């Protein structure tokens, strides 16, 4: 039955028991219910009034911390001769929470999640260290970040007419500012995001398993707005996400083996315990061996 709980529970004084037909220490695990034996039924107790708070384990507090989700480095220079795989003074990123493991493992404790996302963008720069270069000072560049929906058109070059942003949201910011920040709403076509998805995305059999495009937040497109200088620099962009206004359903077993890919749940494990496929806990010599046994002298 639902109730409001702000502190851990009190303990009550208890006496000797010797009663026929009553056995509070015996239980029936096969039913699937957890044991209901209380401390006052197992031992003699004193009265204790308990003042410990429970707020640091609220779900909003557990999940609502800013975590790293993207890190990209690119060269700011004249790109006239660069190969086609290069980030030529701009890049595109498809927003996901799967690339850095500390955020991924925390979100994967739940089956469904509903939240708004607060996004923070941090930028840094350095002079390129070729043997022709001294240090020279660092420029205060302007950057543009444009938000683009999943599968929509994205810019092909640093000076494309696509950057005119007539209905797309854009943010412009300088390297000397505090980090840029904005909130993206809960955008799903369903009432919650699916953290796990046991199905296929399309009507034909050849589609991807475990991927559901309705859960993808969108694309972020980022460029330097300035023209290139006479000398090259390296620019690094970091993106942070903080969930807020959170609801969560159906808790799950935590991940134990290392992650392999952002695309799926595949596994391999360590070569030896802990976290090997055949052994999650580190070994001891026997079930009678106490591993940190105190020695008296």
């Amino acid at each position: 039955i639902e109730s409001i709980i702000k502190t851990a529970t009190d303990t009550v004084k208890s006496e000797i028991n010797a009663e026929l037909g009553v056995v509070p220490s015996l239980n029936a695990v096969e039913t699937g219910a957890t044991s209901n034996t209380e401390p006052e039924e197992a031992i003699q107790t004193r009265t204790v009034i308990n003042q410990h708070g429970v707020s640091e384990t609220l779900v909003e507090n557990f999940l609502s911390r800013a975590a790293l989700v993207s890190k990209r480095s690119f060269e700011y220079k004249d790109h006239t001769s660069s190969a086609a795989q290069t980030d030529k003074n701009f890049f595109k990123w498809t927003i996901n929470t799967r690339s850095f493991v500390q955020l991924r493992r925390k979100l994967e404790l739940f089956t469904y999640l509903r939240f708004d996302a607060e996004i923070t963008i941090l930028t840094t720069v350095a002079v390129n260290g070729s043997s022709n270069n001294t240090y020279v000072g660092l420029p205060d560049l302007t950057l543009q970040a444009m938000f683009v929906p999943t599968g929509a058109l994205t810019p092909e070059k640093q000076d494309s007419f696509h950057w005119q942003s007539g209905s797309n949201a854009s943010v412009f910011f300088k390297i000397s500012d505090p980090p840029a920040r904005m909130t993206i709403p809960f955008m799903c076509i369903n009432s919650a995001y699916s953290v796990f998805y046991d199905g296929f995305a399309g009507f034909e059999k050849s589609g991807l398993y475990g991927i559901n495009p309705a859960d993808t937040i969108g694309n972020l497109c980022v460029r330097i707005v300035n023209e290139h200088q006479p000398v090259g620099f390296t620019v690094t962009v970091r993106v942070y996400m903080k969930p807020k206004h959170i609801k969560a359903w159906a808790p799950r077993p935590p991940r134990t083996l290392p992650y392999m890919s952002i695309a799926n749940a595949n596994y391999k494990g360590k070569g030896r315990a802990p976290n090997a496929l055949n052994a999650i806990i580190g070994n001891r010599d026997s079930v009678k061996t106490m591993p940190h046994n105190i020695v008296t002298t």
Binding site: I1, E2, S3, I4, I5, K6, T31, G32, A33, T34, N36, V54, S55, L58, E60, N61, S64, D116, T183, P185, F186, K244, H245, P251
Partner: peptide, 30 residues
């Protein structure tokens, strides 16, 4: 708490719901 934005989703985090029911996980029996 300060908020001058028009859209309600722009607000700060909410940390005041102390309601619980462990029995849906610990006692799911008839």
């Amino acid at each position: 708490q300060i908020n001058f934005y028009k859209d309600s989703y722009a607000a700060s985090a909410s940390k005041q719901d102390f309601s619980q029911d462990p029995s849906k996980f610990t006692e799911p029996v008839v």
